[PDB]
Design a protein around this ligand. Sequence first.
Ligand SMILES: [Au+]
Ligand SMILES: [Cl-]
Ligand SMILES: [Cl-]
Ligand SMILES: [Cl-]
Lengths: 232, 226
Amino acid sequence: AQSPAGFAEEYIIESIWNNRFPPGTILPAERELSELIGVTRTTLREVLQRLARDGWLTIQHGKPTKVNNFWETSGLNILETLARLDHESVPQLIDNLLSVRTNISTIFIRTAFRQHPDKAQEVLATANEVADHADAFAELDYNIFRGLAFASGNPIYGLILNGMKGLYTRIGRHYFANPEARSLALGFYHKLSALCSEGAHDQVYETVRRYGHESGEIWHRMQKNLLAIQGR
Amino acid sequence: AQSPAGFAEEYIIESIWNNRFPPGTILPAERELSELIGVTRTTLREVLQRLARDGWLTIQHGKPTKVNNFWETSGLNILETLARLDHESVPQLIDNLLSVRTNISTIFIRTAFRQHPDKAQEVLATANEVADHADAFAELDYNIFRGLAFASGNPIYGLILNGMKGLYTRIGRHYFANPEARSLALGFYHKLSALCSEGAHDQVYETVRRYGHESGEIWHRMQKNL
DNA sequence: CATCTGGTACGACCAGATC
DNA sequence: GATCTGGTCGTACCAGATG
Ligand SMILES: [Au+]
Ligand SMILES: [Cl-]
Ligand SMILES: [Cl-]
Ligand SMILES: [Cl-]
């Protein structure tokens, strides 16, 4: 429920996801929709606007607010809010998101070395004074990839990880719980620190592409115990 | 100038980019800030919300809206309203951008083959009925990668490629102009197309990293003139 | 409570799109 | 122009946070 705005948001959202105001179609006049929902127009706008931004609507002046298939207008800044709608199909998602900061990582981790290998070390060094409990770990892990990202020199790789964070640490606070994983991830970290000094670029794609499978097997073995939109 | 909100926002953002409301700091009360800029609280509110979302502010109830190190809470969705402010360092950025759409593609396109090769086709096919001129060409260029990403099975890459669209097109809309560019691009798409029928995976990272530098040279050789 | 700061509510009006 | 639809305005009031 929440407060008017939150309700109206949470509402309008559901209404899309649930083919009520199916994607690709007009959406009621702000006045009509207002009363329908039970908030005031203004309070509606606020909601309409912030949504518009995420990637749902697409407001224009005289034109009516039209809804959108978000995989066509929306950045990683939705993932989270997506995992919360498609309750059933999430293992799929995270699986994907993982097999991404992975593949991708390799690119910018390599670069992070060639340029700025000095700072690429100021990051992998944090792994010393960290805490040991999952929550504090996740926050570090994600803090490392991101850190490097900017380090590879190309900030875009940052703005990306940046978008990930959300659903990227929720997994963290979870997977990491298993100290067995805190190990592999750590060893992993320090295994690499040494390459900035041992400038062995090559010895990247090798690592990650398995640290991907490795850590993965750990997660898959931590799970084995427990509607609109498309894309194509 | 523009409309209140368009302006009222144009303002709030710029003032962040140029320390008037430095990051980590709090920012004026709605009543006060409103009066200050010239729009109505109402109108302001609209702006502050949409702003929050992109990542700038961080509105909480009682507590005072605080600004943020957007470098920590913002995604590609700003690339646009950045290159627009730092109109000095622009090339470095674009360069970065292309030098990303590059490295990334190699991963997902490759993937787009092993799974869904049949569709990786219906896409590179779009490269026939297109049109010549830059404009419509840019659209295609972007759309192929995007097309490919999705077809790659892992839509997340779509999101990203989706988030770059804005800026990644403004580059297309200028680069492609000089046909010598369109050529390379076509020989490129087409180069791949056949590979979908030749399923020779390993033969991808090669062409991309290349085409990256290549198209690049062409684009770099379009800058040093103005 | 007094008082910051954000959140809502109406209601009259301005402005782009459309045919 | 007549009339959809979104954009702005102002004001009086409600609600969370803090001394
Ligand atoms: Au080093
Ligand atoms: Cl808008
Ligand atoms: Cl959860
Ligand atoms: Cl100015």
